[model samples]
Target: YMETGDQRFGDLVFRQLAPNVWQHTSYLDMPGFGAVASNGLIVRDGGRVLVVDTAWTDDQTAQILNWIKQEINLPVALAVVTHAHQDKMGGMDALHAAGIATYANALSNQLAPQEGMVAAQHSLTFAANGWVEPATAPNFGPLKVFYPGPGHTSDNITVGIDGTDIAFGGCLIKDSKAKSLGNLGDADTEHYAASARAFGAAFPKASMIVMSHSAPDSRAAITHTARMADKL
Candidate 1:
């Protein structure tokens, strides 16, 4: 529907968010919750592509890579998982199998395999300010990975796209329409608000905020998430 190639694969769907950015969505079928969708980002920055997150599983992630090759017509140079959650790193194996380098917080990489996700190809160390702009890689420049304390998950982080105001908030930032934080089994209630605030401040100019489970929205979504986190 978007002048792209196949728009659907299994439970994964793709949508264009900007001229050079696209959103990939995959569904996690929960027994009691029906199907829950998780969002990821695909950005083209020259002759290569970058992936913000992976689908819910390796199969779906492979599908994403196929779509990119057929439609975007560029090799995926790298991928960054925003957290250790299944929705974020579930496709680590697929990316690894494709030979695309992957990155995530050191803590996240350690926890990923515990949750059945393959470890990221590379580890990232955050800075004193709770963020890290990893060294530049092929095609694109350095990307900002911010670990804003702990919220949805202890190792949760947000990624800011280079050369653009778009960011992948992952599961740390919520959709503006969300009435509640979806899951808290692994959340840090005491530090959630602080994490949210840091995330909002980390990308003050992120006009296109891509949450893990919702359509891209404005920075106000970050504020909305912060307000909700404050109540926790």
Candidate 2:
């Protein structure tokens, strides 16, 4: 209903994005933040698994963790934060409490909070206030943090699995329809375009690009986003 302000839009979105990957709709629950959508990803490499981002809270994060544990004994090798947005990283404390190693671009360690503060404050203004829990930062293994340039936010980063050709772009790319590019309130437009170009140059051989809020199987979607940024 959020798209067209009609209940019919709900079914249309589900039909389009649900079959290829998992999707869930839940009440936001936080005081300032009303109902919000959360998503998690599990990518397998042999017996190992990489979790891209944790959802909003421990309970939500546990739901996905339980599902993964049922399928494999392999612990989460890495938990990558696409940007510092709470919806993306707020549950890191939960994953950290579970002993999973968390990773992000070194720059994210510096930039996410400063830039994310704007997004967070906006959410709070809308009555969606919540604090990031400390336990969510996993401490199980070596953290592999890489800076893939900036898009959406200066702290943006893409997590790539070692053996799998899949790279999680977080909110860096939108769905094929290009209906959304995420919240650009913290974006550096010229830098965002440069970042997209840089990713293309760096990962030309990547087989797939996984986005946090959109569909995950779009291989050319990131490139298409890069092209769009060039025009911006």
Best by TM-score: 1
Number of clashes in every candidate structure? 0, 13
TM-score of 1: 0.90
* Pairs of colliding residues, candidate 1: none
Error of 1 at 193 (Å): 1.0
What lDDT tens digits, residue by residue, belong to model 2 across residues 104-174? 54455565466442121111100111112223333322222234555777766654544445555666665
Each prediction's whole-model lDDT (CA):
0.82, 0.53
Cand. 2 TM to true fold: 0.65
In terms of lDDT, which candidate is strongest? 1
List candidate 1 segments past 4 Å from native: 1-6, 133-142
For residue 100, model 1's alpha carbon misses the true position, in angstroms, by: 1.2
Segments of candidate 2 deviating more than 4 angstroms: 1-39, 45-48, 111-146, 180-182
